[PDB]
């Protein structure tokens, strides 16, 4: 009786000494809620976002 979560665990080692630079965007709903999303730097920013 084996089982799996339909996922894969990568045996990679953390590399916090350098990551790709990440920009941060601020999205806002209609009712005055603020949300911060650390989007990718070399990526497009979708003005309409599901927060």
């Amino acid at each position: 009786l084996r089982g799996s979560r339909l996922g894969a665990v990568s045996y990679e080692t953390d590399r916090n000494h350098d990551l790709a630079p990440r920009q941060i965007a601020r999205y806002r709903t209609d009712n005055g809620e603020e949300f911060e999303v650390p989007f990718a730097d070399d990526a497009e920013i979708p003005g309409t976002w599901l927060c």
């Binding site: 996922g7 990679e12 650390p38 990718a40 979708p46």
Partner: protein, 137 residues
């Protein structure tokens, strides 16, 4: 990190519940029947709950640890480890208010004592069998 010293149980509020969650599940689907991948805005959605695999987004845009802590602009799942699927919670925004069962049915009823109402009658209220007056002028 340890340094555990106290645990404070307490009645959670709606503002706490929708502050715990990372998304709003709004579709009664779990997995696509043919490709065996979780559905969007479902009970297993990667955007809401985290990636199934390790450091991979849903459309596979970002597949390395160099891309971490960020959210793929298209598919919307934030690229991290896969243990977050054991910790990140969701929430359902109910369209009508509901009452908790522990504070109504468990004897002695707590709604009954708080409001000075009989449970034999409180059941008639909350299961839509009898009216109540919330204000008389």
């Amino acid at each position: 990190v340890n340094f555990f010293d106290e645990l404070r149980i307490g009645l959670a509020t709606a503002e706490d519940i929708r502050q715990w969650s990372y998304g709003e599940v709004k579709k009664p689907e779990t997995i696509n029947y043919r490709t065996l991948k979780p559905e969007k805005d479902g009970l297993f959605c990667e955007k809401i709950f985290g990636p199934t695999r390790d450091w991979e987004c849903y459309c596979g845009k970002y597949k390395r640890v160099r891309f971490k802590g960020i959210i793929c602009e298209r598919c919307g799942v934030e690229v991290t480890r896969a243990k977050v699927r054991r910790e990140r919670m969701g929430h359902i925004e109910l369209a009508a208010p509901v009452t908790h069962i522990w504070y109504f049915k468990g004897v002695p009823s707590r709604l009954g004592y708080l409001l000075d109402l009989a449970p034999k009658d409180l059941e008639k209220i909350i299961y839509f069998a009898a009216y109540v007056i919330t204000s008389v002028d």
